[PDB]
PDB file of C-alpha atoms and ligand atoms in Angstrom:
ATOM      1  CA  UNK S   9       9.741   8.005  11.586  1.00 26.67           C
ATOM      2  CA  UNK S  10      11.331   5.679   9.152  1.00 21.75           C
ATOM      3  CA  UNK S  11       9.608   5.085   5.805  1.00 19.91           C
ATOM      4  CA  UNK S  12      11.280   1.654   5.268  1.00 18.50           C
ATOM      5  CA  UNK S  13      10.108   0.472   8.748  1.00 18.60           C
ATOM      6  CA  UNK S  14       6.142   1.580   8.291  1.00 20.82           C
ATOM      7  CA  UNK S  15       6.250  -0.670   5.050  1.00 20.33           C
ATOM      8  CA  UNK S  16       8.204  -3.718   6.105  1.00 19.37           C
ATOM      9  CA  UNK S  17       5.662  -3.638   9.363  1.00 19.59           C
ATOM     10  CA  UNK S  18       2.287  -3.170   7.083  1.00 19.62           C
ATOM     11  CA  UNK S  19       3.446  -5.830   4.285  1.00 24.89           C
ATOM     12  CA  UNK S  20       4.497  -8.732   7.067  1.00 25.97           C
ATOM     13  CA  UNK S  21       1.243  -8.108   8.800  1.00 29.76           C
ATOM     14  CA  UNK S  22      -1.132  -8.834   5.483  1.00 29.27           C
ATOM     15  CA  UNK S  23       1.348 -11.902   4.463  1.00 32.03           C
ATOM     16  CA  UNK S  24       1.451 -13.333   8.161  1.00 29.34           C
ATOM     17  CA  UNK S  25      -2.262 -13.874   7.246  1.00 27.45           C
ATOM     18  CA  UNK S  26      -2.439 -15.724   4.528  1.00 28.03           C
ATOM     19  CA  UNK S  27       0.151 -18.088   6.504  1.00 25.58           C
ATOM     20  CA  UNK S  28       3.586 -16.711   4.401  1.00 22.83           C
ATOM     21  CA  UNK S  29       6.257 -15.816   7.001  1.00 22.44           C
ATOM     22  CA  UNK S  30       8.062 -12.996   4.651  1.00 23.30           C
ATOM     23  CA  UNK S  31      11.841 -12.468   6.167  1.00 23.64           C
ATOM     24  CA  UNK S  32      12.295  -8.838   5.117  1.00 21.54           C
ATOM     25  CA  UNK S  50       4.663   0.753  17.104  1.00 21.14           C
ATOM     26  CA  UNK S  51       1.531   3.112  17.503  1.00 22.25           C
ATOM     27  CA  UNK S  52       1.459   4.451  13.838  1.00 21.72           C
ATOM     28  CA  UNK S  53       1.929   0.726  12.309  1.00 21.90           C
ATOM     29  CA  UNK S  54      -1.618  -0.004  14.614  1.00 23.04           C
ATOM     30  CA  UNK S  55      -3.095   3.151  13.103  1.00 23.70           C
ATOM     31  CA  UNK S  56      -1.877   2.099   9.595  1.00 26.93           C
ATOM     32  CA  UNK S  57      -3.411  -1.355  10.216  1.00 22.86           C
ATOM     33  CA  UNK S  58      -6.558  -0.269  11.005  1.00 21.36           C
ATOM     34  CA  UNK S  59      -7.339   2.552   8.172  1.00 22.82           C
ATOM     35  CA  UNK S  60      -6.324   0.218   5.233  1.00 21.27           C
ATOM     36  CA  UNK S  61      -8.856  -2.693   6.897  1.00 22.83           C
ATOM     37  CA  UNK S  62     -12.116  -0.076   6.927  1.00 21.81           C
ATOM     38  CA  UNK S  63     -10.896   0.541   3.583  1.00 18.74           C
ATOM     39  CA  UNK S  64     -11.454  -2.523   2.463  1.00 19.03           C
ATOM     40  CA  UNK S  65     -14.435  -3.124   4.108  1.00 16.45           C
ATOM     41  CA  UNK S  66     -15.745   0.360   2.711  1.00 19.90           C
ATOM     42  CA  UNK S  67     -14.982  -0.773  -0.899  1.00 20.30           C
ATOM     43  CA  UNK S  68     -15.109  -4.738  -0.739  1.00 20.24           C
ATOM     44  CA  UNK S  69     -17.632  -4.808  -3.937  1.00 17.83           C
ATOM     45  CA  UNK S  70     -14.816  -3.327  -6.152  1.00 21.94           C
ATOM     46  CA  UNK S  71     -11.938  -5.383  -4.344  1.00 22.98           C
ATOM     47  CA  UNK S  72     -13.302  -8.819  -5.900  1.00 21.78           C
ATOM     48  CA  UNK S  73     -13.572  -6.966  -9.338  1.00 22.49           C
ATOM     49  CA  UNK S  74     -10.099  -5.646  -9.342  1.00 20.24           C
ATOM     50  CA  UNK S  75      -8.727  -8.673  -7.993  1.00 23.09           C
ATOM     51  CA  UNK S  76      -9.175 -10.856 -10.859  1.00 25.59           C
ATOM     52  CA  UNK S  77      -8.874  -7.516 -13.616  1.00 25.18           C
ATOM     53  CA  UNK S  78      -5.339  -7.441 -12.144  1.00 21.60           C
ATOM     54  CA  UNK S  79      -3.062  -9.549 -14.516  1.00 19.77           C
ATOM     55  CA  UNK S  80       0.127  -9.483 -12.339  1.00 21.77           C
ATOM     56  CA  UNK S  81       3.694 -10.889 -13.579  1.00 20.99           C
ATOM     57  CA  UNK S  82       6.934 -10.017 -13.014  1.00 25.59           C
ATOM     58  CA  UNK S  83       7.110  -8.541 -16.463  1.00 27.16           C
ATOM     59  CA  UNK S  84       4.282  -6.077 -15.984  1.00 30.81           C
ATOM     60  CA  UNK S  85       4.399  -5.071 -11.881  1.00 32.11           C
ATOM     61  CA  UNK S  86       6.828  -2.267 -11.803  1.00 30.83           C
ATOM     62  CA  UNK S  87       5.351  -0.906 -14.485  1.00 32.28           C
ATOM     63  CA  UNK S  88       1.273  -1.340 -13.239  1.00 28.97           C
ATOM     64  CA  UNK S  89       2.610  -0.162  -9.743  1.00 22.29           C
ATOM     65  CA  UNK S  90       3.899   2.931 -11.705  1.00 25.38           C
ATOM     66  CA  UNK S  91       0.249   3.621 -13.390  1.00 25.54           C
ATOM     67  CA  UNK S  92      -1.512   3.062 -10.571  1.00 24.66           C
ATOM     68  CA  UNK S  93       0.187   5.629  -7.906  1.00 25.98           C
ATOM     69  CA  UNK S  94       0.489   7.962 -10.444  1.00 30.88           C
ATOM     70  CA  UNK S  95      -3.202   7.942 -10.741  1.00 31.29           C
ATOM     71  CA  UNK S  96      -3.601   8.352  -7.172  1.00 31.24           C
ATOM     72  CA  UNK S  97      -1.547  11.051  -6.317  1.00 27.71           C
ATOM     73  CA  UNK S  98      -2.465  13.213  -9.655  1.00 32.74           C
ATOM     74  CA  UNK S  99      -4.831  15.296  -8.055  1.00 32.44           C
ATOM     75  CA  UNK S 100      -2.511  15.527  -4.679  1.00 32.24           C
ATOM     76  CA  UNK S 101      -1.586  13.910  -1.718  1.00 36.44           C
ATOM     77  CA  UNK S 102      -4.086  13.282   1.391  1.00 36.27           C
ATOM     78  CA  UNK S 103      -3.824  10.514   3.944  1.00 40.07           C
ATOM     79  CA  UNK S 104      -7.058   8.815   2.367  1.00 41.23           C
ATOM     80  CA  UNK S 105      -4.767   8.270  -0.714  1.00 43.05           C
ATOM     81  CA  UNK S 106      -1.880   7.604   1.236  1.00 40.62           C
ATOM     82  CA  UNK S 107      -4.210   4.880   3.398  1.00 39.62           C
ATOM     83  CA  UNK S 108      -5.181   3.404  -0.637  1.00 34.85           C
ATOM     84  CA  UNK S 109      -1.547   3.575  -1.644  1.00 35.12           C
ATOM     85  CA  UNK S 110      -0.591   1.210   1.074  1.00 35.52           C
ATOM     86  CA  UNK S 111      -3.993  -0.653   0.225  1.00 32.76           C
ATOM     87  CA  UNK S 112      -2.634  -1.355  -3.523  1.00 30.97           C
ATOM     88  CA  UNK S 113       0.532  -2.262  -2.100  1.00 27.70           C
ATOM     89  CA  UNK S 114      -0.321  -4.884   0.016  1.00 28.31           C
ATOM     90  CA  UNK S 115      -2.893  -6.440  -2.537  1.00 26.80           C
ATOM     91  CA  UNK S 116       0.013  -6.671  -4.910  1.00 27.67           C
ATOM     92  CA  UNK S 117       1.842  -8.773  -2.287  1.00 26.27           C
ATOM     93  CA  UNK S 118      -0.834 -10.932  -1.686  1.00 28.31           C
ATOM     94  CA  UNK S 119      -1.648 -11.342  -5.064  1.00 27.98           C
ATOM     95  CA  UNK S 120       2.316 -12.005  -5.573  1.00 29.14           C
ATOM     96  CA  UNK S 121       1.678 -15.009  -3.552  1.00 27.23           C
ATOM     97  CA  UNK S 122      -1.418 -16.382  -4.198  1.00 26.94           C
ATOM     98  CA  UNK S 123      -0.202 -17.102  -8.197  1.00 26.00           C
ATOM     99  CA  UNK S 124       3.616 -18.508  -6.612  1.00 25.06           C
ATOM    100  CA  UNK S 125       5.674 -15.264  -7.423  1.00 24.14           C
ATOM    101  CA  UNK S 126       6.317 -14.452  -4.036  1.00 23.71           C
ATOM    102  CA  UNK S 127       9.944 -13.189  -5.166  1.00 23.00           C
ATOM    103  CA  UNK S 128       7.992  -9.714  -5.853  1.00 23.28           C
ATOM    104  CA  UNK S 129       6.952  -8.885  -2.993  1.00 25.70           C
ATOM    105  CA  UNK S 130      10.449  -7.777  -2.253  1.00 27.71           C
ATOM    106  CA  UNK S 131      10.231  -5.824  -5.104  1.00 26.23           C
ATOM    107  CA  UNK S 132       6.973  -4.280  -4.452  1.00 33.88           C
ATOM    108  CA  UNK S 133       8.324  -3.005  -0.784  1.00 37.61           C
ATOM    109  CA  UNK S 134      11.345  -1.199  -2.292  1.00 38.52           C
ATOM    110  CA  UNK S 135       8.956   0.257  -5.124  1.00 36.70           C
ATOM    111  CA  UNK S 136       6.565   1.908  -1.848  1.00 36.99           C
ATOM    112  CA  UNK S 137       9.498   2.799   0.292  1.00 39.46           C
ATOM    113  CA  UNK S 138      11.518   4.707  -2.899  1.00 38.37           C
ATOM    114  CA  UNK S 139       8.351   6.049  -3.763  1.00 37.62           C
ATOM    115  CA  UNK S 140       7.188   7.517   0.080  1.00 38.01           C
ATOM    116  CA  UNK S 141      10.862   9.120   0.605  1.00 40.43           C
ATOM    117  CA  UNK S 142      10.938  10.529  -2.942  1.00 40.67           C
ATOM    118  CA  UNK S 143       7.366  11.601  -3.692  1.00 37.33           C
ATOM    119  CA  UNK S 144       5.597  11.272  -0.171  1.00 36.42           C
ATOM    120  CA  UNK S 145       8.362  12.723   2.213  1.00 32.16           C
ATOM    121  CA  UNK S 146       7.989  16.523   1.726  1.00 31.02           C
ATOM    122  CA  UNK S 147       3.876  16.191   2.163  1.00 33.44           C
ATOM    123  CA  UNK S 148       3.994  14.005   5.178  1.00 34.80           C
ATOM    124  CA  UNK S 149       7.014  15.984   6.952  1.00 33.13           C
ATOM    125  CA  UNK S 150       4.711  19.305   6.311  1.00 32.22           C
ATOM    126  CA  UNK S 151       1.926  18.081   7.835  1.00 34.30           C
ATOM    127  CA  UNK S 152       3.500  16.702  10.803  1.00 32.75           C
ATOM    128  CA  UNK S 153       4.676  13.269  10.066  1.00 29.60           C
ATOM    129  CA  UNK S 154       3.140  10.129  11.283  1.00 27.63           C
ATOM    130  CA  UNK S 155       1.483  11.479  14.262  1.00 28.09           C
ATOM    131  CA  UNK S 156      -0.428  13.552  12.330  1.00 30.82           C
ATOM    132  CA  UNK S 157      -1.824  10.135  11.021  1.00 31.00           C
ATOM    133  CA  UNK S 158      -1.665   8.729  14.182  1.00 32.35           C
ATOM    134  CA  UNK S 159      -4.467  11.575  15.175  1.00 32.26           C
ATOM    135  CA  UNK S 160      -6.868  11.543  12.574  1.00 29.98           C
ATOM    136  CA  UNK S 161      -6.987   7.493  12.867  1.00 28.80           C
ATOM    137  CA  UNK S 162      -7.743   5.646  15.838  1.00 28.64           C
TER     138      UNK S 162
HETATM  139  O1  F3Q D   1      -8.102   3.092  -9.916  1.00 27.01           O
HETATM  140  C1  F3Q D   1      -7.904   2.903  -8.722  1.00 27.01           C
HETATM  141  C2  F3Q D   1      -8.251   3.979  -7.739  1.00 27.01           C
HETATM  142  C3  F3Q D   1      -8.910   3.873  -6.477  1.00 27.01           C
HETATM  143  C4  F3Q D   1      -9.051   5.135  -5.953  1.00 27.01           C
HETATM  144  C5  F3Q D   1      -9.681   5.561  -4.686  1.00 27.01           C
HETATM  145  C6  F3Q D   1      -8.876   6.075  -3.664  1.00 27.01           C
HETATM  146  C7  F3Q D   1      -9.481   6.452  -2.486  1.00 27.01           C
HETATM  147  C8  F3Q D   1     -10.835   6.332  -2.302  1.00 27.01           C
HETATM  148  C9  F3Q D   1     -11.657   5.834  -3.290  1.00 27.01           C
HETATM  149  C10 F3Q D   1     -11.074   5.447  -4.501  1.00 27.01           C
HETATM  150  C11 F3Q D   1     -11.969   4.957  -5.604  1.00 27.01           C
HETATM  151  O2  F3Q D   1     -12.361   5.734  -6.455  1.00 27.01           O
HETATM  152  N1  F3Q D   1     -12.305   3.651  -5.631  1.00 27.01           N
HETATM  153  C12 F3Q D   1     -11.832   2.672  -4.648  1.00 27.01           C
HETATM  154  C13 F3Q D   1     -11.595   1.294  -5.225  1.00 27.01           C
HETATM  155  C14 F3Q D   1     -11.080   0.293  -4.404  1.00 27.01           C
HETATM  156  C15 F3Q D   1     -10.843  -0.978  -4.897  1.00 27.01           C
HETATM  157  C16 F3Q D   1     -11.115  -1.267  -6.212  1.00 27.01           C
HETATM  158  C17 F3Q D   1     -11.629  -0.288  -7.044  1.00 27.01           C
HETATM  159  C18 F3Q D   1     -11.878   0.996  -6.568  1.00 27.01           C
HETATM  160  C19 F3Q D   1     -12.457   2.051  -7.475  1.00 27.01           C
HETATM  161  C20 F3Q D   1     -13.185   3.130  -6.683  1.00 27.01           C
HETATM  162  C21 F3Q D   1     -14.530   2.668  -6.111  1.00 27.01           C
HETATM  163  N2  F3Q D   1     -15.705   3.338  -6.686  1.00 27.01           N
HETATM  164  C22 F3Q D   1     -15.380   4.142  -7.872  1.00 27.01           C
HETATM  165  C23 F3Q D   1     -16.364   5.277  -8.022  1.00 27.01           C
HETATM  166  O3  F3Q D   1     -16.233   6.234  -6.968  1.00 27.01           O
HETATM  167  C24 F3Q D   1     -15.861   5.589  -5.750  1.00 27.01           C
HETATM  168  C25 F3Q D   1     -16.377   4.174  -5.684  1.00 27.01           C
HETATM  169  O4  F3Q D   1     -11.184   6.769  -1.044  1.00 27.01           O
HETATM  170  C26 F3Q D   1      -9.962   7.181  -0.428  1.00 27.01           C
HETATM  171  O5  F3Q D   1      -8.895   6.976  -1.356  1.00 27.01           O
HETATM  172  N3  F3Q D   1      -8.491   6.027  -6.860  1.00 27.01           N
HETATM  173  C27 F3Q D   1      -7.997   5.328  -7.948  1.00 27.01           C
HETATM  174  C28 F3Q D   1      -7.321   6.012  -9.093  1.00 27.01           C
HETATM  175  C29 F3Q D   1      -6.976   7.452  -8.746  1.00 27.01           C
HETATM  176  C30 F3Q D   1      -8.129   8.144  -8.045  1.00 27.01           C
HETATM  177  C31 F3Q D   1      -8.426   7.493  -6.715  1.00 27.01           C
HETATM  178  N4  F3Q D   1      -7.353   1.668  -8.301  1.00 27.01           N
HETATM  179  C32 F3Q D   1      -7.173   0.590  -9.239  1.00 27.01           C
HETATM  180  C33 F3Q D   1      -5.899   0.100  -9.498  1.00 27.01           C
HETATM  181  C34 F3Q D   1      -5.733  -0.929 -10.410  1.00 27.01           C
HETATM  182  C35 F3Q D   1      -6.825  -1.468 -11.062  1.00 27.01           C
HETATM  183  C36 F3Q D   1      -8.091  -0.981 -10.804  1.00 27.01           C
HETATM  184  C37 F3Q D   1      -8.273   0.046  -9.892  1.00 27.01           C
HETATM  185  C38 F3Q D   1      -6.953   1.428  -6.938  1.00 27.01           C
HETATM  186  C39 F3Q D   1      -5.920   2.164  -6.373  1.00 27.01           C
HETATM  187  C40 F3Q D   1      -5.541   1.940  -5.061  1.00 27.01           C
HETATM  188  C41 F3Q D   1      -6.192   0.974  -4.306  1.00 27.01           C
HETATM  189  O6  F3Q D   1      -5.835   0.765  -3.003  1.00 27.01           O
HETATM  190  C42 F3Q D   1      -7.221   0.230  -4.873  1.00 27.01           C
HETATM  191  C43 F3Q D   1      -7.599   0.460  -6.183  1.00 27.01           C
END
């Protein structure tokens, strides 16, 4: 259902992790799982973008812009809706691992603007979350 909510969920889940408790149910399970075999599908290029990412708070909203408009050029699908939440969350942790963990506030409202302004129409057409919820899991 709510855009917001699937975010919030997803982005306290990665930070819980890495022991940062962010102040800020079957789809957020699906969600969970999808973005993890996505990292373990493309961990070699993970530890090369990692470090090629120079993130401030002078340059995020405008690398978060580049890099979902690259994604969603060539259309929507839930594999590119699975990496857009992927990007998102690796922002976030990278937000706290160099101490700018004021972001990742930012970075939430960027992905929740972004799914109920660009995502909404392609989601709602193909069923909403459950649809997710089915091909997942
Ligand atoms: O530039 C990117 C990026 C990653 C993917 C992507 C999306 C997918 C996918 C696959 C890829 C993909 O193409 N890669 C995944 C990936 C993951 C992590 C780090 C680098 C890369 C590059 C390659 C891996 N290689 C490339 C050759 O063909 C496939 C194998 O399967 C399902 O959805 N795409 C882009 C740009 C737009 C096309 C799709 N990031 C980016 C952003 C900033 C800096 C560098 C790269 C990016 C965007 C979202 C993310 O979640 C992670 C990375």
């Amino acid at each position: 259902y709510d855009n917001r909510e699937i975010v919030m969920k997803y982005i306290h889940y990665k930070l819980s992790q890495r022991g940062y408790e962010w102040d800020a149910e079957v789809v957020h399970l699906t969600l969970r799982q999808a973005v993890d075999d996505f990292s373990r599908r493309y961990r070699r290029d993970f530890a090369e973008m990692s470090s090629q990412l120079h993130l401030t708070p002078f340059t995020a909203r405008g690398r978060f812009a580049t890099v979902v408009e690259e994604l969603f050029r060539d259309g929507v699908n839930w594999g590119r809706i699975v990496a857009f939440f992927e990007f998102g969350g690796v922002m976030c942790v990278e937000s706290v691992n160099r101490e700018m963990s004021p972001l990742v506030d930012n970075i939430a409202l960027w992905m929740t603007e972004y799914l109920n302004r660009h995502l909404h129409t392609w989601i709602q057409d193909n069923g909403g979350w459950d649809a997710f919820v089915e091909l997942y899991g």
